[PDB]
């Protein structure tokens, strides 16, 4: 029978003088679903209920289950178990995050940084809120493709060595691509102020074009590109085009 | 039992409250722009140094390398010279040492170009071996 | 001076220190990839060339030894030519690679070729040309020197 | 608190919202905008909520694609409900839809666009123009295949503008009750194991559904009916729990939803004979019939030997006849999901699908203002002071016996908004935040402690699994008296096995063994009540189909003209809401019944819609 071994990072913050450990678990691939989350759930359920990880959705849309599997940041729920039973799969928390317990990192800086970009629509002229749709052309909303799909999982940011060293001052790929998402939205009027929040030497410019972010993104998005775009706008090599004018009959 | 204490709100970044009185910091964009233009400008310099030698090339190299390396190690120092791991004063000190690096780099190059063989000839002499 | 989020982030780091939480491992467990390894090579080649220029320029100045007696010393060791030419290759590769990959990184800054296929092609290409150029610069003159030694007039 | 000592922490808020999905966040935005000090208590980061998994769209008669009227959406909603929905609530829902969706776009939701630059809309299941006489509606507004994701991230981002205070990864244990008044909530903080009592003038329960009561669902692991369980433990009867939506197209293997929008855009269901069989079960609407009808159709095909795959136990959803540009533009999400979970390229091969538990139209009963109610025959509806409910955890009832596709994201925003509006209007800056009664929450803490140290021989994961398999077998698509009665017995026995619970993790910090065990208790309350409600309801209405009572049982036989008939009294027919009242200790359930509200909010604005025979 096909017995796959997983080596899983463990940490118990309630034991005095506790250190992180690596724990091997054996799992029968013929009695388990095809994804790594399935194995985590099977282990928790059938061997060790103290095994602790985040999860919710089953189809890679929630972002809860981000972790490092076989050296790469991904989502457990859509990462196929490697069926080569002669090799072990290592499972670690998202790199360089403070761990609360086992595979659960503290996510609150990531979230606070997201908050800081002011991820909401901003208008110069006050709008009557329920009254009418704002105009946006197909071509203009399609600029958001590649951008709006982000599930805020933090695989990209926890893959970035510059974010590893300077998370307190470097906003990281996830938050920067969202900041760009609000900057290139033709309906949003605050592009210049959004740019000025990350004008300093660290916020955006500590991207050293390492490219791990785009490489590891489980949704196949490209934070690297969006940061290059931010760099261009910040250096004034590029501008945000003006909105297309709203037709007379709209 | 529930003989309890009064809580405070969790730590939470308020993006509007934080924005009150926030005067934007100076823009690093123009510095970043020139750093990259300079590096692009050095692209022809490196092959030019392969084909043309002497004391004037030695001087062009010394100056361009020194500036480029100045900005270079400054970025490295800012990556790894982290207050979180070094404390505030040692972090400040490695920031200063980056300027000491640049200064010493140029002085030693000027020396080498003025009292030794110079950069381009130095390469010839190792390649002849 | 800091943005408010940077201030908030410092106070966050201090909270996490106070809580005595470990930091999930990173360098020791992340899969080596053409992304962060080439980046690392770019930084290492950059800094090695810098360091060599500093130690060289200041060292020779502070020492009685000059570069001419340094070169004559190693010729004196009479070590095999293939190994001498390897040292040359090693000296040349950082210059080649760092220059080439520098151009690549400036493109990345301008949002050029950041798709994964282009990232990988450019990496391989930059490592390849750099090796090809370092090879040429070492081999060609060695070729001339073999012709001078064993061909007529 | 018997064995351990717990750090208890007290807060004071104008309003507490339990839930940070679509409904909870929309409520929070409205309340923060109105200056109320607002606490959002959620057992996960808001953006992991199940709203984020929603795909197909959100209904509103914007008329981007063709002329439309909100009254046509009203009609389809009422018919959709199979006349078990409250028409005053359905009126409120559909009347406010254009404004609600326009708000979302105004908040920055990146809706797909038409060539005129308006919000693109698609067709969906069970919707029509001109009160069912016209053609197929197109009022399902969408962000491609990812409308839930996009709506939730938009709402969450906007909630940051309005100074609500977020208590993230706090697991709510109980409502804090004082003499039939809700004065707040008590929750466990996962990060540090502390227990928090939130005092509040008002409380909104917005906790989602309980799909995980079944073995196969489309729903998140977090859909454990915690809110309806909280209400039960507060002495409040739950409503219409027997009405479980099976969505026609969960992926056969793993339960992953494939949006109805795929049919909306022109996809169709195929059996093993290569027949587009929905043309037989629903000659007019076809594959865009209502969800109860399509799911029953598929299930009959399987029974009668026209099921597909090696075990002839599922159906094909065909999309490959559609242009690749349409598939990518309109359905990119399921295109990727079908590829990851079924090895299927939708440009070339069909998706293997099967009906799968998906949505709960039942829940905490409210009036049209989303104020929670208790009902007796003698006194009618009485509001529970302090307490509101919205989203899937509620039963307003806007969906009656069958929820219409794309009405639930609508429901959550519209009634989440309604909560903030109704609270601003009825709550005055004079009323003071209540003081907690002595010992408040102490029983919740005692239950926590006992589950945390549970010592028995049946581990929470086995017990959950038997619950789920039991529900799957006995309270399925087609139900019957003997199968249901046997199901009730097995389920009331499982409720007994809860006393034999075993847990292993003894920690207080991020103990998912503990939280999942609490969720099992919560799920048992929902499941037990669901099936006994289903056992007693001897009729076939919407999502509830009885083989031994195949007909819909109304006050009149609506298949014949009304002139001449004598009306059956309340106690004889079944056009009425089920109310299940459970004792959380013993598990004993009693049943009562509450009339459907047939009147609209305003007869001058819109006519009520009398029942007819329901056919698509
Ligand atoms: C796969 C899928 C696709 C769907 N697609 C569509 C669609 O396209 N269109 C449509 O109209 N409808 C759709 N629906 C239905 C619809 O998305 C949901 O019914 C609706 O979004 C639920 O919103 P909600 O805010 O009520 O609950 P949820 O979004 O489920 O949020 C529940 C919230 O309550 C919190 N909570 C729960 N228990 C506790 C506790 N004990 N303590 C603290 N907090 C707690 C959770 O943390 C969470 O934040 C879909 C459903 C599914 C399952
Ligand atoms: C660790 C290593 C430390 C190194 C020191 C760091 C300093 C670097 C600065 C040097 C700048 C270039 C020097 C060129 C040079 O010395 O002449 C050739 C010489 C030979 O003498 P020689 O024998 O005199 O050479 C023959 C004379 N004709 O040295 C070489 O051959 C080096 C080869 C340089 C490769 C060029 C890079 C390719 C760039 C491509 C750019 C692409 C598009 C534009
Ligand atoms: C010839 C063309 C060259 C180009 C186009 C170039 C380009 C660059 C660029 C773009 C960076 C920034 C890397 C980053 O921030 O991520 C960099 C860094 C650096 N370069 Fe160069 N460079 C060149 C030559 C040299 C040379 C000859 C040296 C010799 C000492 C040198 C030393 C450095 C150093 C030390 C850094 C450090 C910063 C880092 O790794 O980030 N460079 N270079
Ligand atoms: C040389 C080797 C040991 C292989 C290595 C490779 C890569 C790393 C991680 N990379 C880095 O630390 C790095 C590399 C280049 C530019 C910027 C950084 C930053 F500070 F921003 F992270 C660290 C160490
Ligand atoms: S970008 Fe890709 S990886 Fe980074 S957060 Fe958004 S989804 Fe996760
Ligand atoms: S990995 Fe990090 S340095 Fe820039 S390109 Fe991606 S953010
Ligand atoms: S559980 Fe949602 S992304 Fe994995």
Q: Name the CATH topology of A1-106.
A: Ubiquitin-like (UB roll) (3.10.20)
Set of chain A residues whose Cβ sits within 8 Å of the Cβ of B35: none
Peptide bond into A126 cis (omega under 30): no
Residue nearest to atom 8 of ligand 4 (CA): C40
Write down which chains contact chain C via at least 3 CB pairs under 8 A.
A, B
Q: Which of D503, D525, D551 is the last residue of a domain?
A: D551
Which residues in chain B touch residue C5, judged by CB atoms under 8 angstroms apart?
Answer: 13, 18
Sorted by where each begins, the domain ranges of chain A are: 1-106, 107-250
- On the CB side of A163, CA atoms within 13 Å amount to 28
Residues 6+ positions from D276 with CB-CB distance below 8 Å: D268, D269, D270, D286, D287
Write the burial class of residue C105 (CB in 10 Å: 0-12 exposed, 13-18 middle, 19+ buried). buried
Cα end-to-end span (Å), chain C = 71
The answer to the question of whether B68 is labelled as a binding residue is yes
Residue owning tokens 């040359």: C88
**Distance from C-alpha of D530 to C-alpha of D526, rounded to nearest angstrom:** 6
Distance, in Å, from the CA atom of D171 to the CA atom of D515, rounded to the nearest integer, reads 8
Q: Are A105 and A98 in contact (CB under 8 A)?
A: yes
Pairwise CA distance, residues D566 & D564, whole Å: 7
Q: What kind and span of H or E run contains D333?
A: helix D332-342
Backbone phi and psi for residue D278, each to the nearest 5 degrees, phi listed first = -65, -25
How far, in Å, CA of A151 to CA of A154, rounded?
A: 9
DSSP one-letter code for D161: G
Distance CA C104, CA C109 (A): 9
Distances (CA, A) of D586 to A169, D24, D180: 55, 32, 21
Question: Are A209 and A224 within 8 A, CB to CB?
Answer: yes
Q: Assign D141 to helix, strand or coil.
A: strand
Nearest to D569 by CA among D556, D551, D552, D550: D556
- The residue range of the domain holding D306 is 251-354
Q: Do A116 and B24 touch (CB under 8 A)?
A: no
Maximum Cα–Cα distance for chain D, whole Å? 70
Q: How far apart are CA C78 and CA B60, in angstroms?
A: 34
Please choose, from the candidates D265, D361, D357, the residue with its C-alpha nearest in 3D space to the C-alpha of residue D318. Answer: D265
Tokens of D132: 């069912």
Q: What angle do CA A125, A131, A134 make, to 5 degrees?
A: 60
Running DSSP on this structure, what letter comes out for residue D378? T
Task: Give yes or no for a contact between A124 and B24, defined as CB atoms under 8 angstroms apart.
Answer: no
DSSP secondary structure letter of residue D539: S
Under a CB-based contact definition with an 8 Å cutoff, are residues D432 and D111 in contact?
no
Nearest-Å Rg of the Cα atoms of chain A is: 21
Burial class (CB in 10 A: 0-12, 13-18, 19+), A72: middle
Would you tell me how many other CB atoms lie within 10 Å of the CB of residue A70?
A: 16
Q: ∠ CA(D359), CA(D577), CA(D95), 5° rounding? A: 65
Helix, strand, coil distribution of chain C in percent, nearest 5: 75, 0, 20
Cα(B63)–Cα(B42) distance, rounded to whole angstroms?
11
C-alpha D535/C-alpha A197 separation (Å) is 61
8 A C-beta contact, residue D499 and residue D521: no
> What is the distance between the alpha carbons of residues D294 and B112, in angstroms, rounded to a whole number?
86
The CA distance from D539 to D547, in Å, is 9
For position C153, which CATH number holds? 1.20.1300.10
Query: Both D578 and D604 in a single domain?
Result: yes
In contact, D173 and D441? CB cutoff 8 Å = yes
Q: Is A218 on the interface with D (CB under 8 A)?
A: no
* Cβ-based burial of A71 (10 A; exposed 0-12, middle 13-18, buried ≥19): middle
Q: How far apart are CA D200 and CA D183, in angstroms?
A: 5
The end-to-end CA distance of chain D, in Å, is: 56
With tokens 């924005």, the residue in question is: B19
Print the SS3 string covering chain A. CCEEEEEEEECCCCCCCCCCEEEEEEEEHHHCCCEHHHHHHHHHHHCCCCCCCCCCCCCCCCCCCEEEECCEEEEHHHCECCCCCCCCEEEECCCCCEEEECCEECCHHHHHHHHHCCCCCCCCCCCCCCCCCCCCCHHHHHHHCCCCCCCCCCCCHHHCHHHHHHCCCCCHHHHHHHHHHHHCCCCCCCHHHHHHCCCCCCCCCCCCCCCHHHHHCCCCCCHHHHHHHHHHHHCCCCCCCCCCCCCCCC
- D580-611 in b/e burial notation, b at 16+ Cβ within 10 A? bbbebeebebeeebbebbbebeeeeebeebeb
**What is the residue whose two structure tokens read 């859909």?**
D223
Judged by DSSP in three states, D603 sits in coil
Q: How far apart are CA A38 and CA A41, in angstroms?
A: 5
8 A C-beta contact, residue D410 and residue D262:
no
Burial of D566 from C-beta contacts in 10 A (0-12 / 13-18 / 19+): exposed
Burial of D481 (0-12, 13-18, 19+ CB in 10 A): middle
- Ligand 4 binding pocket, CB closer than 6 Å: A 161-162, 165, 208; B 79; C 27, 36, 39-40, 43-44
**Spatial contact of C10 and B13, defined as CB atoms under 8 Å apart:** no
Asked if residues A168 and A97 have their Cβ atoms less than 8 Å apart, the reply is no
Supply the angle between the helices C81-109 and C116-150 in degrees, to the nearest 10. Answer: 150
Euclidean distance between CA atoms D200 and D184, whole angstroms? 5
Report helix, strand or coil for D395. strand
Output the domain CATH number for residue D513: 1.20.58.100
∠ at Cα A106 (A104, A109), nearest 5°? Answer: 150
Chain centroid, CA B12 distance in Å: 34
Would you tell me how many other CB atoms lie within 10 Å of the CB of residue A189?
A: 15
Domain span holding position C61: 1-153
Q: Are residues D442 and D516 in the same domain?
A: yes
CATH number, position B39: 1.20.1300.10
Task: State the residue for tokens 């083989």.
Answer: D547
Chain A CB contacts of D191 under 8 Å are 100, 106
Residue at token pair 């092609």: C121
C140 by Cβ neighbours in 10 Å (0-12 / 13-18 / 19+) ranks as exposed
Q: How many domains does chain D have?
A: 4
Using CA atoms, how far apart are residues D544 and D244, in angstroms rounded to an integer? 7
- Please report residues of A whose CB lies closer than 8 A to that of B32: 205, 231, 234-235
Residues 6+ apart with CB under 8 A from B28: A199, A200, A201, A205, A234
Cα B47 to ligand 2 centre (Å): 7
Interstrand relation of D8-18 and D181-189 (parallel, antiparallel or unpaired): unpaired
Element (H, E) at D373: strand D371-376
Ligand 2 center to C133 CA (angstroms): 10
Task: Provide the 10 A C-beta neighbour count for residue C122.
Answer: 23
User: How far apart are alpha carbons D253 and D248 in whole angstroms?
Assistant: 14
CATH superfamily of A107-250: Alpha-helical ferredoxin (1.10.1060.10)
CB D128 within 8 A of CB D135: yes
Domain limit, last residue, from D393, D409, D434? D434
The two tokens of residue D4 are 């351990």
Rounded to 10 deg, the angle between the B119-128 and B55-80 helix axes is 100
Number of domains in chain B: 1
Tokens 């207050």, located at residue: B83
Centre of ligand 2 to C-alpha C49, Å, is 12
| DSSP secondary structure letters along D466-511 | HHHHHHHHHSSSEE-HHHHHHHHHHHHHHHHHGGGEE-----SSS-
DSSP conformation class of D542: T
Q: What residues pair up with D239 in beta bridges, in sequence order?
A: D363, D579
Nearest CA among D522, D210, D202, D235 for reference residue D371? D202
The answer to whether A115 contacts B27, with C-beta atoms less than 8 Å apart, is no
Contact D55, D239 (CB under 8 A): no
Q: Is D291 among the residues known to form the active site?
A: yes
Give the number of other CB atoms < 10 A from CB of residue B22.
11
The CATH number for D204's domain is 3.50.50.60
**Is residue D220 a contact partner of residue D33, using CB atoms and an 8 Å limit?**
no
Break chain D down into helix, strand, coil percent, rounded to 5. 35, 20, 45
Q: How far is CA B29 from CA A205, A235, B34, B72, D307, in A?
A: 8, 4, 9, 16, 63
**Do residues D305 and D420 share a domain?**
no
Confirm if D226 and D207 have CB atoms less than 8 A apart: yes
Distance, CA of D348 to CA of D354 (rounded, Å)? 20
Distance CA A82, CA D338 (A): 20
Cβ neighbours around D534 below 10 Å, total: 23
* Positive or negative: CA dihedral B90, B96, B100, B105: positive
The H or E element that residue B62 is part of is: helix B55-80
Give the separation between CA C93 and CA C97, rounded to whole angstroms: 6
Domain stop point among D322, D339, D354? D354
Q: Is A246 on the interface with D (CB under 8 A)?
A: yes
Q: Assess contact for D291 and D246: CB atoms under 8 A.
A: yes
Q: State the DSSP H helix or E strand holding residue D530, giving kind and residue range, or none if neither.
A: helix D512-536
Residue B88 Cα, gap to closest chain C Cα (Å): 12
Furthest CA-CA distance within chain C: 80
Q: Token pair for residue A34?
A: 């095809």
> Taking a contact as any Cβ pair under 8 Å apart, which residues of chain A between 107 and 136 contact chain B?
108, 112-113, 115-118
Place of tokens 């958001």: A144
Q: For a pocket test of ligand 6, which of A209, A214, A217 has the largest count of ligand atoms closer than 8 A to its C-beta? A: A209
What 8-state DSSP symbol labels residue D43?
A: S
Both ends of chain B: CA-CA distance in Å?
85
Catalytic, out of D48, D139, D291, D403: D291
Please name the helix (run of DSSP H) or strand (run of DSSP E) that holds residue D372, with its range, or none.
strand D371-376
Q: Do C33 and A208 touch (CB under 8 A)?
A: no
Nearest to D284 by CA among D422, D408, D164, D125: D125
Do residues D467 and D498 lie in contact, with contact meaning Cβ atoms separated by under 8 Å?
Answer: no
CATH code (residue D265):
3.90.700.10
CB D357 within 8 A of CB D214: yes
The residue ranges of DSSP E strands in D324-367, in sequence order, are 351-360, 364-365
Sign of CA dihedral D124, D125, D128, D134: positive
Touching A: which chains, 3+ CB pairs < 8 A? B, C, D
- Structurally, how many domains does chain C consist of? 1
Backbone angles phi, psi at A104, to 5 degrees: -105, 100
Q: Give the C-alpha separation, C2 to B114, whole Å.
A: 44
Alpha carbon distance A175, A197 (integer Å): 13
Give residue B27's domain range: 1-129
Among the bound ligands, the one closest to the CA of D125 = 1
- Co-location of D507 and D544 in the same domain: yes
**DSSP H or E run through D13:** strand D8-18
């Amino acid at each position: 029978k096909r017995i796959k071994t997983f080596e899983i990072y463990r940490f118990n913050p309630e034991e005095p003088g506790a250190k992180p450990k690596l724990q091997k678990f054996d799992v029968d691939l013929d009695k388990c679903g095809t994804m790594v989350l399935d194995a985590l759930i099977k282990i928790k359920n059938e061997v060790d209920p103290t095994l602790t990880f985040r999860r919710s959705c089953r189809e890679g849309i929630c972002g809860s289950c981000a972790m490092n599997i076989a050296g790469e940041n991904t989502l457990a729920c859509i990462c196929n178990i490697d069926q080569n039973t002669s090799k072990t799969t290592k499972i670690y928390p998202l790199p360089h995050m403070f761990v609360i317990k086992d595979l659960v990192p503290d996510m609150n800086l990531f979230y606070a940084q997201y908050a800081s970009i002011q991820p909401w629509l901003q208008k110069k002229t006050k709008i009557n809120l329920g009254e009418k749709q704002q105009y946006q052309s197909i071509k203009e909303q399609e600029k958001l493709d590649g951008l709006y799909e982000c599930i805020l999982c933090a695989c990209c940011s926890a893959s970035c060595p510059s974010y590893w060293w300077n998370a307190d001052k470097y906003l990281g790929p996830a938050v920067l691509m969202q900041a760009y998402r609000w900057i290139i939205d033709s309906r949003d009027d605050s592009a210049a102020e959004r740019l000025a929040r990350m004008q300093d030497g660290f916020s955006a410019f500590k991207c050293h074009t390492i490219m791990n972010c785009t490489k590891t993104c489980p949704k196949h998005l490209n934070p690297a590109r969006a940061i290059g775009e931010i760099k261009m706008l910040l250096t004034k090599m590029k501008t945000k085009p003006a909105p297309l004018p709203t037709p007379a009959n709209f | 039992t529930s003989a309890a204490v009064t809580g405070a709100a969790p730590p939470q970044f308020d993006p509007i409250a934080a924005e009150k009185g926030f005067k934007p910091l100076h823009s690093h964009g123009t510095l970043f722009k020139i750093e990259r233009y300079f590096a692009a400008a050095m692209v022809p310099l490196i092959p030019a140094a392969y084909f043309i030698h002497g004391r004037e090339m030695d001087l062009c190299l010394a100056l361009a390398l020194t500036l480029h390396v100045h900005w270079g190690v400054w970025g490295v120092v800012n990556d790894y010279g982290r207050p979180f791991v070094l404390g505030d004063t040692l972090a400040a000190a490695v920031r200063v040492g980056a300027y000491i690096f640049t200064a010493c780099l140029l002085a030693g190059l000027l020396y080498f170009n003025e009292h030794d063989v110079g950069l381009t000839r130095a390469f010839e002499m190792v390649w002849e071996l | 001076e800091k943005t408010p989020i940077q201030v908030w982030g410092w106070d966050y780091l201090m909270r996490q220190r106070a809580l005595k939480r470990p930091i999930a491992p990173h360098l020791t467990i992340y899969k080596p990839q053409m992304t962060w390894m080439v980046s690392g090579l770019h930084r290492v080649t950059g800094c090695a060339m810098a360091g060599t220029l500093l130690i060289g320029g200041v060292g020779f100045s502070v020492l009685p030894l000059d570069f001419t007696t340094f070169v004559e010393f190693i010729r004196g060791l009479g070590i095999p030519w293939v190994i001498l030419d390897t040292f040359k290759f090693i000296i040349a590769f950082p210059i080649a690679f760092h220059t080439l990959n520098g151009i690549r990184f400036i493109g990345f800054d301008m949002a050029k070729g950041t798709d994964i296929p282009s990232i990988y092609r450019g990496a391989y290409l930059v490592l390849g040309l750099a090796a090809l150029i370092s090879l040429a610069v070492v081999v060609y003159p060695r070729w001339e020197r073999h012709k001078k030694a064993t061909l007529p007039t | 608190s018997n064995i351990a000592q717990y750090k208890v922490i007290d807060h004071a808020y104008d309003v507490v919202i339990i839930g940070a999905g679509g409904a909870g966040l929309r409520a929070a935005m409205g309340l923060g905008e109105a200056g109320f000090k607002t606490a959002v208590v959620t057992k996960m980061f808001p953006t992991r909520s199940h709203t984020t998994a929603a795909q197909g769209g959100i209904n509103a008669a914007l008329g981007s694609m063709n002329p439309d009227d909100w009254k046509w959406h009203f009609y389809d909603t009422v018919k959709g409900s199979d006349w078990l929905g409250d028409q005053n609530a359905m009126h409120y829902l559909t009347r406010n839809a254009v404004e609600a969706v326009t708000e979302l776009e105004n908040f920055g939701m990146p809706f797909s666009r038409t060539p005129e630059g308006k919000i693109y809309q698609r067709s969906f299941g069970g919707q029509s123009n001109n009160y069912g006489k016209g053609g197929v509606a197109k009022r399902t507004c969408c962000v491609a295949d990812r409308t839930g994701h996009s709506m939730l991230h938009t709402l969450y981002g906007n909630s940051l503008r309005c100074h609500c205070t977020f208590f993230i990864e706090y697991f709510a244990l109980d409502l804090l009750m004082d003499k039939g008044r809700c004065v707040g909530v008590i929750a466990l903080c996962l990060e540090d194991g502390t227990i928090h009592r939130f005092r509040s003038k008002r409380t909104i329960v917005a906790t989602g559904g309980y799909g995980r009561a079944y073995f196969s669902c489309t729903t998140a692991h977090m859909n454990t009916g915690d809110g309806t369980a909280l209400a039960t433990r507060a002495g409040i009867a739950l409503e219409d729990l027997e009405f479980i939506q099976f969505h026609p197209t969960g992926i056969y293997g793993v339960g992953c939803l494939i949006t109805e929008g795929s049919r909306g855009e022109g996809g169709f269901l195929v059996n093993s004979e290569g027949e587009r069989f929905m043309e037989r079960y629903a000659p007019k609407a076809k594959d865009l019939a209502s969800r109860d009808v399509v799911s029953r159709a598929e299930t009959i095909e399987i029974m009668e030997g026209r099921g597909v795959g090696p075990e002839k136990d599922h159906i094909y959803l065909q999309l490959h006849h559609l242009p690749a540009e349409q598939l990518h533009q309109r359905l990119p999400g399921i295109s990727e999901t079908a590829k990851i979970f079924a090895g299927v390229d939708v440009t070339k091969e069909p998706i293997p699908v099967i009906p799968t538990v998906h949505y709960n139209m039942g829940g905490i009963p409210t009036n049209y203002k989303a104020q929670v109610i208790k009902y007796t025959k003698e006194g009618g509806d009485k509001i529970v002071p302090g307490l509101y409910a919205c989203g899937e955890c509620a039963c307003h009832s806007v969906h009656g016996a069958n929820r219409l596709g794309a009405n639930s994201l609508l429901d959550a925003v519209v009634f989440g908004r309604a909560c903030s509006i109704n609270i601003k209007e009825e709550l005055k800056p004079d009323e003071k935040i209540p003081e907690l009664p002595e010992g408040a929450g102490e029983e919740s803490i005692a239950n926590l402690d006992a589950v945390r140290y549970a010592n028995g021989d049946v581990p929470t994961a086995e017990l959950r699994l038997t619950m789920q398999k039991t529900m799957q077998k006995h309270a399925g698509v087609f139900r019957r008296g003997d199968i249901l009665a046997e199901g009730v017995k097995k389920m009331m026995d499982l409720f007994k096995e809860l006393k034999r619970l075993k847990t292993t993790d003894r920690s207080l910090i991020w103990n998912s063994d503990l939280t999942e065990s609490l969720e099992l208790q919560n799920l048992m309350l929902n499941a037990t009540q669901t099936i006994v409600a289903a056992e007693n309801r001897k009729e076939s209405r919407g999502a509830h189909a009885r083989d031994d009572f195949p007909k819909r049982e109304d006050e009149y036989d609506y298949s014949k003209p009304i002139e001449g008939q004598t009306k059956r009294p309340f106690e004889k027919h079944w056009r009425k809401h089920t109310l299940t009242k459970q004792d959380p200790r013993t598990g004993h359930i009693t049943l009562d019944y509450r009339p459907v509200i047939d009147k609209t909010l305003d007869p001058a604005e819109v006519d009520w819609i009398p029942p007819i025979i329901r056919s698509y």
